[PDB]
Amino acid sequence: DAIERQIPNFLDGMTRARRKILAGGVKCFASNNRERKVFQFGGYVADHMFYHHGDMSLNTSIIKAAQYYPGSSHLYPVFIGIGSFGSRHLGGKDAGSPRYISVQLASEFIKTMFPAEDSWLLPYVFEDGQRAEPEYYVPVLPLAIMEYGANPSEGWKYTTWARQLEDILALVRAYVDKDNPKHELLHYAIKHKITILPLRPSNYNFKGHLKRFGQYYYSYGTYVISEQRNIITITELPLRVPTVAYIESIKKSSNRMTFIEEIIDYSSSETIEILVKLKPNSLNRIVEEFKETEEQDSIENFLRLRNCLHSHLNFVKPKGGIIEFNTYYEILYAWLPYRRELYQKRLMREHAVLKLRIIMETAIVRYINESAELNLSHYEDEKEASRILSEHGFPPLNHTLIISPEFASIEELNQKALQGCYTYILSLQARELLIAAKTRRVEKIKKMQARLDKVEQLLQESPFPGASVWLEEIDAVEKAIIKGRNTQWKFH
Amino acid sequence: DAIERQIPNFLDGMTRARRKILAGGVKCFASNNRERKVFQFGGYVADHMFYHHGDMSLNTSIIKAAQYYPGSSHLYPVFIGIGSFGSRHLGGKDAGSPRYISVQLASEFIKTMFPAEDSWLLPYVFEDGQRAEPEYYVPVLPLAIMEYGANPSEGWKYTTWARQLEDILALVRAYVDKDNPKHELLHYAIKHKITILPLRPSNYNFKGHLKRFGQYYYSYGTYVISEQRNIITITELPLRVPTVAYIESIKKSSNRMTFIEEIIDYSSSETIEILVKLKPNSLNRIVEEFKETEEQDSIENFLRLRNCLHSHLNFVKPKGGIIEFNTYYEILYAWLPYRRELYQKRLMREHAVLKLRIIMETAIVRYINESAELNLSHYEDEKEASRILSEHGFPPLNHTLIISPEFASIEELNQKALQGCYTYILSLQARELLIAAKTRRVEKIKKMQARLDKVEQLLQESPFPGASVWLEEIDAVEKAIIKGRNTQWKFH
């Protein structure tokens, strides 16, 4: 449980509670995207999705999911937050109060990242006989290794250093489109379990850099030296270390305080800007003391602006169970076929529903045509009308499932929708036998048949079904992340 | 306006505000008889009925209308009250707090005293473009001189000493029923403006008595003498004087305090019980001082337990205006013909509505029969269906007024209900042509025609219409008042 909550799935990078937060949010702001306050939304959550814990951790994790700061664990804010949600400069955890700040669901992104139609398709866990969360979402991108995580967690320290964006764009556009030259070469690679394409950590809003040594990567920040004023200007840090913790860590080592004179903090979470005046003969005696090597100079040994980016990637598979990984390539391998199978189930279900709609509307317009021959206004039993409408060719229909085909398997969709009462022909007094309604129902049958033929085309798409849909959806997610990040999560 | 508010109508004995109170109460407790508190009900009043004053006088008059004490101005509680609404012993005005006591509408009486069906029939005053109160109610009894009123009011001191109950029962059962031997003799009397029947003031829960001198009655209370203890026990008062005001009025006259020793108050509003010990040789020296006459003895001069019942009866006629009276007989004369005219309008309106219902349901079952000949499923316009259903004999019906005939004159009821669309035949798909519905609609036509024949009988009732209805309704009011008085407005 504790391991099951604090180590995420390889499909979400999120807890069960985080998925509950998102599910309740989609349930909330669907009709109207007006910003709530935090506690109203939290009460909505704890009522609806059965948030099984206390509201302190609820409001905590909600504002954690609203942490929009450079170097957060979210490159993608789930919620547009209005207020004051934190600062990396002051350790990150300096948000506002749960009475002032406003959360709002960023549905203009979430409709694209999460397939809104396929929300029905997901294997839910209907506990307590009631509507509960996805067992796992499925995103358009593989989101579960696109964002950082650095926490004391169960079993292992949870550590997900990020990747790039366009590397995964290239990988997935490669795996889908056959217009890749490397397309079957990628299938060759996946078949042979070999790595062929660059898979680089993130670079967004981080002006330091990386190298590889051994297997590890080392990250470096920047500095400016001026022995005129005898001041070093620090402008760049390693990956996700707060400002105050760094300055206090500099004031830890009395061995290095032997030349540390004056530390002035001009920084913010917006801009890192630290001015450090040192003693006379600082740098030369540092060179005399600190062994300057290739991996760090005297300044990189002194100020300690490098980081070894060790990782821990041992996630939780669906249908119960923990799957333990070694590379990011394993994660992308595991991520692909579930999305493929989801598109397959998607278009098969849509094909079944289009079958049943065309069947029902044909039977209806057939009755409108046979208004003359039937004319059965000398009957007094409804089951009499059932039997006589079973004479002249009208099929038993359970139109309740026909109008809304909720949550079912495709087999039960075709079985138990055809076993109902004929009330759709029937209800009330006269005038709907008039032919203008007949005409518009025929127009509906024509559009449904054209859509059915488009479905039956896309059933046979190479090399797996629905691939052009997924190219369109990655195009939409590209539009979404461009609109978001290039406006930096303002959406205005 | 102040005269218009503080002098009532001769049909209500109530203010415009009191009629607003009753109207909002019927509007409130209609669906459910679950009691409010006072302030919720007052807010319901001030919102709905446009209560044109402040809530202090509102809660004041509401608890005034919940005053159930022997010697109130209400023999008939409009509202069942739960709490503690006052005491005659302490001057009457010692109610509870407006946020802890409960009012409840006594609809089981009010349905009988106020004709619930004829609530539609009343000439309303629809000001501000919206729903407002009756100009005047009409009760089954002449309520407006059945209950006391003793107040400093505009123009005159408002004074309505009560009558009996069964005197007015005899008067009105005489005016209606021709099985009275005095029936045409009463018509002789009303034609000749003479008084023929006893018209006595109230006696309920007043063990004193009355006599006539000149024109007035004088009312006498009781006393018990014991010169053993030299104590007089007062058990009965005059009509509606509080206990503490009486004892203080006894302690006013120092001329009589020359023998007043000790006044002990064992009384309540339930029971009057006052023990007065006097000085030795009180009564004999009182006889030596007070001139014992016929109209009062030495005790009735001393304790002053008599009352001259002067009156002021100058009420406010409807359609504007003040009508000024001389006798109760004038009031009963004015009261009769309006209720007569109300029954006439009542049964004429019901006759019009039964006409229109039988017309519509005959046209409907005619269409159900002519389903075969029409079969007009080869049309595409609704006005086409209008014209072709105007061919085969189906009348234009404004069914909106037909289903609910609100608030209209009978002429507009027959004019503008026949000028509408044929949508009652029409609006949806088919199955209501199945003839069990036809059968039950025929059953409806049969009961409507039988009820129409009963109406056309009662149109010709001697000597004025609806008189047997009014005998039934006075029987119901008799049942209600006996049921209440045996239960003391507890109704349990």
Author numbering:
A (entry chain A), B (entry chain B): 701 to 1192
The authors write:
One intriguing example is the African swine fever virus, which stands as the sole mammalian-infecting virus encoding a type II topoisomerase. The ORF P1192R encodes a functional Topo II (pP1192R) which is highly conserved across diverse ASFV isolates. Prior extensive structural and biochemical studies have elucidated key aspects of Topo II catalytic mechanisms. These structures have unveiled the inherent architecture of Topo II, which is characterized by two principal heart-shaped functional domains: the ATPase domain, responsible for ATP hydrolysis to fuel the molecular machinery, and the central domain, which interacts with the DNA duplex and contains a catalytic tyrosine residue that cleaves the DNA duplex. As a result, Topo II not only relaxes DNA supercoiling but also disentangles knots and catenates potentially detrimental to cellular function if left unresolved.
The apo pP1192R (full-length and the central domain) were plunged-frozen on an amorphous alloy film (R1.2/1.3, Au, 300 mesh) at the concentration of 0.8 mg/ml. Notably, three distinct apo conformations exist: pP1192RClose, pP1192RCoil-open and pP1192RWHD-open. A comparative analysis of the three apo central domain structures (pP1192RClose, pP1192RCoil-open and pP1192RWHD-open) reveals that notable conformational shifts are evident within these structures.
